[PDB]
Amino acid sequence: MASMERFLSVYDEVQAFLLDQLQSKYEIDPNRARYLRIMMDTTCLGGKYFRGMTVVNVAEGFLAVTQHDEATKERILHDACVGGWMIEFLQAHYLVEDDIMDGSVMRRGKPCWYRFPGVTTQCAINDGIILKSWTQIMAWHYFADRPFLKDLLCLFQKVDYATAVGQMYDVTSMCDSNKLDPEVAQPMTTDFAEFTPAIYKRIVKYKTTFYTYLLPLVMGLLVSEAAASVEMNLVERVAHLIGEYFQVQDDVMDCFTPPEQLGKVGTDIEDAKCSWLAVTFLGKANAAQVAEFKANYGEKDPAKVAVVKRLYSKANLQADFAAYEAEVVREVESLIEQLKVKSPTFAESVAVVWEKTHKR
Amino acid sequence: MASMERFLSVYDEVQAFLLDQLQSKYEIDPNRARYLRIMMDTTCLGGKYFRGMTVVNVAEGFLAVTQHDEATKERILHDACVGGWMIEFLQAHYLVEDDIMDGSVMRRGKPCWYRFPGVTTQCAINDGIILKSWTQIMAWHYFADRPFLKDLLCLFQKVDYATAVGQMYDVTSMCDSNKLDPEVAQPMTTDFAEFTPAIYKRIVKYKTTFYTYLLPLVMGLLVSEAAASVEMNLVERVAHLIGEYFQVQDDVMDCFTPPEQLGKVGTDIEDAKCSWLAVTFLGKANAAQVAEFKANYGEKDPAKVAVVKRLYSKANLQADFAAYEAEVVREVESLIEQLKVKSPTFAESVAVVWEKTHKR
Ligand SMILES: CN1Cc2cc(F)ccc2NCCC1=O
Ligand SMILES: CN1Cc2cc(F)ccc2NCCC1=O
Ligand SMILES: [Zn+2]
Ligand SMILES: [Zn+2]
Ligand SMILES: [Zn+2]
Ligand SMILES: [Zn+2]
């Protein structure tokens, strides 16, 4: 069976399971079950399934070099699909909540969930809670007797928690640290002293790389019982590197990709986000460029946003990006090589993850 | 050592642990650690700690009848305190999110977290995420080698999930079920056909009773390794009964308790909530009373809210409440008795839970 149709089939199975359970054990009525079915479909489906499919691809890699009964191959691939859906639903939780937090309009060319007319924020905040709760229900049901259950649940929590901490680093990225204070409304930075590579890297490492790259890779290893085929520090290092690159591309596209192609009107400039473009621009600007950037950044006014875009275009940030891209190619290839000392197969899965990231 | 000072001491310990961990493993800076410290204190502290202290009281009960080394008594009480804080932090997560969902103003005579000037909804939604994530971090750290870890984490998830499903039942309680639909803005019910005792009971069972009563009782049993001293169906039945009673009192107080004493301006009438008062009023009203109630319920207009209050006062709902209260006294005493077949101690803890509920 091809991997993607397996993966999509298991979505239907897990949906049925969750909704059947709500009816037998949580007293749900058919109309609220329908509401939850629609919510799940709307929030979990229509992406590329990169994260969840990575769990399946890692597991397929190991299957090709490990002796197993056919039933065992099937069980492992079914666990990989379940595990992939936990990651997709964890993503779904964060997109629902982040779109409410950020007052976002669209996502993927469709309205954010909370903006649907029969949803509203009141329900959507709790729908997003449910999305994440479903990841646990899946796990406890499908993995109750599995030897990797403990390790999988402990990994998943950590990644969830890293993610939430990353969200805090992101939403507070335009504030001056020494001014954080629940009692006092937070001004935007005026010096941009915290728009540094190291501070950027911290935001991205926690907000994206743990759930997007580390967790799919390591879930593949756990459902395969293959964590001893790898040096976990190397898996972490490569995940964080690749994940950083992924976000740098997202940052660049928020600004320069046509909204119809983006799926989204990009607002990083108005939102005063600590983007790769802002940081890299500040890393090369002269005094006058820095002052013009300060006078225009983090303002809804379209005349000012267009000044920030003009500054970025004039500053030749494509040069810095190809330099960055070169260095990431270097380091990711070094790490892949180090990953072959213990697992050629695993290193090859990492290669494929890198290729899918480095092209899109 | 007295139970409450133990419990409060363990709060400080767990706080220190969480913030120290953020610094050593999650790259946090001191100012964001301070923000999280303040958030934790503001959201987790200043209640009565009923839920978390119930875990400690159940555990104390078992200690008084079970032979153990002093070090083991200390370990059990420390686990009970940790477990109690997981419940308090789970509550904190739901109050933060529910206050944002409901557009609430105050809670306990202080502003809702999201309304603090340096917080805002953008941060508060994610602060509430973190609150719940901290419950898992506590568990994995303090209970990593404990034999009850699996059972505790599986119970906790279920209770979390019941809670979220209860929140969905509550936020959708004024809608007609057959009209739920993400695509279509939801009208308030005009017939109130779903304002029934059974429908009310379902809302309350899931939204409150699992986290408020079931989880503290069963956590006490798990940290005591005492789940075999009870018939779990009886613990569930008693939890749900007592929990229902608790919410009926909250419902009555939302309407009739002075806001300065309530901690809150009560808005259940304006919010068109399926409250015990609404249901019980509809269960006894004549046609004219039902029509006046329909013309006035679920409106912000203070003239209409005062009409709904007048209808409730005229309808002598105190009578129905003392009748309800009588029946709950009957059934809770029956269940306590059934709980003595297997554990006098456990039954006595349930008695104390009932006494603290039935007086406040
Ligand atoms: C717990 N902590 C952060 C972390 C979070 C995760 F999600 C996954 C891995 C790691 N490990 C790196 C450092 C550490 O020990
Ligand atoms: C899982 N489900 C609902 C439930 C949720 C909980 F939080 C705790 C207990 C129960 N048990 C009653 C019925 C059932 O088996
Ligand atoms: Zn965001
Ligand atoms: Zn972006
Ligand atoms: Zn609410
Ligand atoms: Zn209330």
CATH code assigned at B35: 1.10.600.10
The number of residues making up chain A comes to 360
- Distances in Å between the Cα of B237 and the Cα atoms of B169, B242, B275 are 20, 9, 22
Asked if B242 and B332 touch (Cβ cutoff 8 Å), the reply is: yes
| Residue in B89, B93, B120, B129 to test binding to A, most A beta-carbons within 10 Å | B129
Residue among B138, B18, B28 nearest B86 (CA): B138
CB contact under 8 A, B32 and A183: no
Asked if B160 is an interface residue toward chain A (Cβ–Cβ < 8 A), one would say: yes
Question: Chains A, B: CB contacts under 8 A, how many?
Answer: 165
- d(CA A166, CA B278) in angstroms, rounded, equals 44
Tell me the nearest-neighbour CA distance from B271 into chain A, angstroms.
12
Instruction: Quote the domain boundaries for residue A94.
Output: 1-360
- Distances in Å between the Cα of B236 and the Cα atoms of B202, B214, B232, B248 are 14, 6, 6, 18
- d(CA A278, CA A296) in angstroms, rounded, equals 12
- d(CA A203, CA A169) in angstroms, rounded, equals 5
Residue A191 assigned as binding residue: no
- Distances in Å between the Cα of B120 and the Cα atoms of A212, A256, B71, B190 are 27, 30, 45, 35
CB contact under 8 A, A136 and B160: yes
Q: Which residue has the tokens 């603090």?
A: B116
The experimental method behind these coordinates is X-ray
Q: Hey, what amino acid is at B219?
A: M
User: Structure tokens of B220?
Assistant: 């006490």
Residue A250 assigned as binding residue: yes
Residue among A269, A283, A358, A274 nearest A322 (CA): A358
Residues of chain B with Cβ-Cβ distance to A168 below 8 Å are 32, 35-36, 123, 126-127, 130
Resolution in A: 1.6
Q: Hey, what amino acid is at B344?
A: P
B111 sits in which H/E element:
strand B110-111
CB contact under 8 A, B118 and A171: no
Q: Where are the alpha helices (DSSP H) in chain B?
A: 3-25, 30-44, 50-63, 70-101, 120-142, 149-171, 197-204, 215-223, 232-256, 259-262, 276-282, 287-296, 302-314, 317-342, 344-359
Shortest-distance ligand to the CA of residue A27 = 2
Residue A151 assigned as binding residue: no
- d(CA A339, CA B332) in angstroms, rounded, equals 62
Beta bridge mates, B107: B110
Interface of A with B in 32-71 (CB under 8 A): 32, 34-36, 38-39, 42
Residue among A350, A336, A134, A340 nearest A221 (CA): A350
- d(CA B251, CA B278) in angstroms, rounded, equals 9
User: Number of structural domains, chain B?
Assistant: 1
Asked if A193 is an interface residue toward chain B (Cβ–Cβ < 8 A), one would say: no
Q: Which residue of B97, B127, B140 is in closest CB contact with A125?
A: B97
* Nearest Cα residue to atom 4 of ligand 2: B158
- d(CA A233, CA A227) in angstroms, rounded, equals 12
Cα of B15 vs its chain's centroid, Å: 22
* Nearest Cα residue to atom 10 of ligand 2: B158
